[PDB]
Design a protein around this motif. Structure first.
Motif, PDB file in Angstrom:
ATOM      1  N   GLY A   1       0.739  -1.018  -0.144  1.00  0.00           N
ATOM      2  CA  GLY A   1      -0.152  -0.107  -0.077  1.00  0.00           C
ATOM      3  C   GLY A   1       0.719   1.213   0.118  1.00  0.00           C
ATOM      4  O   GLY A   1       1.640   1.506   0.904  1.00  0.00           O
ATOM      5  N   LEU A   2       0.833   2.028  -1.067  1.00  0.00           N
ATOM      6  CA  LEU A   2       1.375   3.321  -1.273  1.00  0.00           C
ATOM      7  C   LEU A   2       0.766   4.402  -0.455  1.00  0.00           C
ATOM      8  O   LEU A   2       1.450   5.422   0.169  1.00  0.00           O
ATOM      9  CB  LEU A   2       1.435   3.568  -2.702  1.00  0.00           C
ATOM     10  N   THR A   3      -0.451   4.429  -0.296  1.00  0.00           N
ATOM     11  CA  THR A   3      -1.424   5.072   0.429  1.00  0.00           C
ATOM     12  C   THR A   3      -1.931   4.249   1.784  1.00  0.00           C
ATOM     13  O   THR A   3      -2.214   3.397   1.403  1.00  0.00           O
ATOM     14  CB  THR A   3      -2.875   5.229  -0.428  1.00  0.00           C
ATOM     15  N   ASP A   4      -1.456   4.998   2.783  1.00  0.00           N
ATOM     16  CA  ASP A   4      -1.758   4.098   4.221  1.00  0.00           C
ATOM     17  C   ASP A   4      -3.226   4.192   4.746  1.00  0.00           C
ATOM     18  O   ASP A   4      -3.893   4.941   3.769  1.00  0.00           O
ATOM     19  CB  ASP A   4      -0.650   4.543   5.175  1.00  0.00           C
ATOM     20  N   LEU A   5      -3.532   3.680   5.647  1.00  0.00           N
ATOM     21  CA  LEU A   5      -4.897   3.831   6.316  1.00  0.00           C
ATOM     22  C   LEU A   5      -5.363   5.110   6.152  1.00  0.00           C
ATOM     23  O   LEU A   5      -5.254   6.192   6.413  1.00  0.00           O
ATOM     24  CB  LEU A   5      -4.771   3.408   7.642  1.00  0.00           C
TER      25      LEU A   5
ATOM     26  N   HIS B   1      -6.726  10.100   7.775  1.00  0.00           N
ATOM     27  CA  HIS B   1      -5.742   9.525   6.561  1.00  0.00           C
ATOM     28  C   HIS B   1      -4.457   9.725   7.420  1.00  0.00           C
ATOM     29  O   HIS B   1      -4.015  10.822   7.830  1.00  0.00           O
ATOM     30  CB  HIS B   1      -5.746  10.640   5.543  1.00  0.00           C
ATOM     31  N   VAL B   2      -3.786   8.429   7.134  1.00  0.00           N
ATOM     32  CA  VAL B   2      -2.403   8.302   7.706  1.00  0.00           C
ATOM     33  C   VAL B   2      -1.435   8.826   6.649  1.00  0.00           C
ATOM     34  O   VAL B   2      -1.714   8.620   5.308  1.00  0.00           O
ATOM     35  CB  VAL B   2      -2.014   7.006   8.097  1.00  0.00           C
ATOM     36  N   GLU B   3      -0.444   9.845   6.931  1.00  0.00           N
ATOM     37  CA  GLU B   3       0.283  10.542   6.186  1.00  0.00           C
ATOM     38  C   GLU B   3       1.758  10.484   6.571  1.00  0.00           C
ATOM     39  O   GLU B   3       2.421  11.199   7.623  1.00  0.00           O
ATOM     40  CB  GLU B   3       0.076  12.083   6.170  1.00  0.00           C
TER      41      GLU B   3
ATOM     42  N   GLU C   1     -16.082   3.375   6.517  1.00  0.00           N
ATOM     43  CA  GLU C   1     -15.842   3.199   5.211  1.00  0.00           C
ATOM     44  C   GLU C   1     -14.253   3.342   4.826  1.00  0.00           C
ATOM     45  O   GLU C   1     -13.642   4.161   5.363  1.00  0.00           O
ATOM     46  CB  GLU C   1     -16.405   4.585   4.528  1.00  0.00           C
ATOM     47  N   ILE C   2     -13.570   2.297   4.589  1.00  0.00           N
ATOM     48  CA  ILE C   2     -12.300   1.972   4.323  1.00  0.00           C
ATOM     49  C   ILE C   2     -11.777   2.480   2.836  1.00  0.00           C
ATOM     50  O   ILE C   2     -11.796   1.667   2.163  1.00  0.00           O
ATOM     51  CB  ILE C   2     -11.671   0.523   4.925  1.00  0.00           C
ATOM     52  N   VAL C   3     -11.456   3.595   2.618  1.00  0.00           N
ATOM     53  CA  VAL C   3     -10.985   4.227   1.627  1.00  0.00           C
ATOM     54  C   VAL C   3      -9.456   3.276   1.297  1.00  0.00           C
ATOM     55  O   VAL C   3      -9.500   3.178  -0.089  1.00  0.00           O
ATOM     56  CB  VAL C   3     -10.650   5.530   1.554  1.00  0.00           C
ATOM     57  N   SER C   4      -8.713   3.277   2.192  1.00  0.00           N
ATOM     58  CA  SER C   4      -7.413   2.592   2.028  1.00  0.00           C
ATOM     59  C   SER C   4      -7.139   1.847   2.944  1.00  0.00           C
ATOM     60  O   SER C   4      -7.025   2.438   4.275  1.00  0.00           O
ATOM     61  CB  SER C   4      -6.461   3.707   1.532  1.00  0.00           C
ATOM     62  N   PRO C   5      -6.796   0.378   3.248  1.00  0.00           N
ATOM     63  CA  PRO C   5      -6.591  -0.362   4.170  1.00  0.00           C
ATOM     64  C   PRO C   5      -5.193  -0.114   4.753  1.00  0.00           C
ATOM     65  O   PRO C   5      -4.604   0.663   4.279  1.00  0.00           O
ATOM     66  CB  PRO C   5      -6.855  -1.768   3.870  1.00  0.00           C
TER      67      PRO C   5
END
Lengths: 370, 375
Positions: free
Chosen positions: B1-5, B85-87, B56-60
């Protein structure tokens, strides 16, 4: 008298009087006698308590035999509050008091009446005002008084009387609260300017919720009277700041907002303030940005709508002193009167050149944080 | 995953699940895991807790943040949807007009939560909460691990809960739906068990302990799961203290007695004791000595047996009366070197007759509070 003090009265009446009087007794009594409350039967019962704040309550009672007796104030207030809701019979029997109420019975030890100190005489009545006004105006300013007995010059509420007008003020060096009100002077032209311990004055004013008009007596003591109650309070021997000249008459910037919305936002944003030290406020046209915190723990930010006039200004405040000020206005909206980030803000209840300040009964001056 | 949680859910649901998990460096953290249409909130200690909620899990993914600060934030946020959003090493949390940037702690160092044992049985949440709180008052609050727990004793469709500190003992029996033939007894820390039973609305609770036991109590229901380390100590023997009959019996009004204890105890030196002198039709409550003051109060009682005097600690006595949950209290006595038994009274009759003076049979109740006299 062969029959010493004997009387009968209702528990509610007795319990309220004893508790009110026993409240101000010494925390560390030098002699055991100083822990007692004096009961004197004549018409009615007097309940007396001695200290740096002495109090006396007078209530209706059936005096079967008159006299006086000194008993532990705190134990008597606890017994009376807890007794069955039935008439209370009190009979002094030698050096003991027999207290009977319904099916409950007590035998209490007495202390010598001769050793109890005489209560000071209240000064002459200076004026009066309704209980609701005294209660609400005192509670408004009390929030700014200092609560550290090591700095007793900050622990009072300044009272200034100029005939029918009373000005109240309190400060702790980080904030100054000032409240003006009208009262019934006795008689006109009367001038008085005293400093009263804030804690006791606030407790007297909250208890005043009777109603029943509160009579203030100043002629080193403040006398408080009404509701069959009388008290004396030693005044503070300290100078008070010249608060009137510290209030600005004009502002370079003026911000109007909703109190409830702002209080809520301060409390949210302040969760990440290091040791709750500061909340930063960035005002500009139509908006204020609230912010707090550092990366190591966390940062917070919330934007709120503002009716703003002046150039943008960024100013920081202690979140607790800001919410105390906001909470004390008792208005839906708040006006913030500013100059620079290092000079105080003026909080009052509610196109480029400076803005004249609005006349209000109450003001809360709040020092900024750098 | 490039995009985190990355997820979104309602504040109320988020805040309640976080607060329930965070109540008990990396140890301070709460782990948030996004999978499909669900979010898991996990807390590790000696008592682990996991809450599962819809989101609503946009990114796991997974992220560890300060549990206390996240519970404080979520309870106080505007009532609007919460976007998370984890950044990198920061969590951007957004909700209405409010924004937060929270630092993360490394996920790899967070301990895995224990697996809950196999299910032993279930009972309504109202019953579990109600029965645990009744007995919990008697547990020791110290050094003596044998007294700091609640005994949970299972025998088929019956469960027996007990707690003691050697001054008092509370025992409650209840019926449950066992998942056999189950014959087992364990000791669970009282403070944790009490909190978990109060916190739970409320869909039925499942307790997880055939021939097994050691050494965790799993508690489950309402998308919530916890494990609790069992106490290795031995609960004291108590069945010898429950007689089949009494030498004397007394029934009184609970509320009247609680009020009279509190009034007379005002003069009890160190609040150590209140004396009760039972006789036909009346009991005399008394306390204190002349140096401070003496108190006395006579209350009506339905009494049977020879008159007796007994001294009790007023707090242990009021704690026992408060736990009965009945209008009336039944007191049962045997001998001076033995405890008094307090039972709740249900629908009713004169206590003695037709037994006269003779021993009085004990009447069964689900609950009993044993109180030792002051020696």
């Amino acid at each position: 008298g062969l029959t010493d003090l004997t009387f009968r009265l209702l528990r509610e009446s007795f319990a309220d009087a004893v508790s009110w009087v026993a409240k101000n007794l010494p925390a560390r009594p030098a002699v055991p006698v100083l822990s007692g409350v004096l009961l004197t039967g004549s018409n009615g019962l007097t309940i007396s308590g001695f200290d740096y704040e002495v109090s006396e309550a007078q209530v209706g009672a059936e005096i079967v035999s008159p006299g006086s007796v000194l008993v532990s104030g705190r134990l008597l207030s606890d017994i009376t509050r807890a007794l069955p809701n039935k008439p209370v019979d009190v009979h002094v029997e030698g050096n003991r008091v027999a207290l009977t109420c319904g099916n409950a019975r007590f035998s209490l030890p007495t202390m010598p009446v001769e050793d109890y100190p005489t209560l000071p005489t209240l000064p002459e009545e200076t004026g009066l005002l309704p209980a609701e006004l005294f209660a609400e105006a005192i509670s408004q300013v009390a929030i700014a008084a200092g609560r550290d007995d090591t700095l007793p010059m900050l622990t009072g509420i300044r009272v200034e009387i100029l005939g029918e007008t009373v000005v109240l003020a309190a400060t702790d060096r980080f904030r100054l609260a000032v409240r003006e009100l009208k009262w019934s002077a006795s008689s006109p032209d009367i001038e008085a300017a005293v400093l009263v311990p804030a804690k006791t004055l606030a407790e007297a004013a909250k208890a005043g919720i009777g109603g029943s008009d509160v009579r203030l007596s100043l002629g080193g003591l403040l006398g408080i009277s009404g509701n069959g109650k009388r008290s004396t309070t030693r005044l503070l021997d300290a100078e008070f700041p010249k608060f009137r000249q510290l209030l600005p008459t004009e502002h370079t910037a003026v911000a109007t907002m909703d109190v409830a919305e702002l209080i809520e936002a301060i409390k949210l944003v302040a969760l990440v303030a290091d040791r709750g030290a500061q909340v930063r406020m960035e005002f500009a046209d139509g908006s204020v940005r609230l912010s707090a915190g550092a990366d190591d723990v966390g940062r917070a930010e919330e934007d709120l709508v503002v009716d703003y006039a002046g150039e943008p200004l960024t100013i920081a405040f202690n979140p607790t002193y800001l919410t105390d000020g906001l909470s004390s206005l008792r208005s839906e909206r708040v006006s913030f009167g500013f100059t620079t980030a290092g000079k105080p803000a003026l909080l009052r209840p509610v196109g480029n050149g400076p803005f004249p300040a609005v006349s209000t009964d109450y003001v809360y001056l709040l020092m900024p944080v750098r």
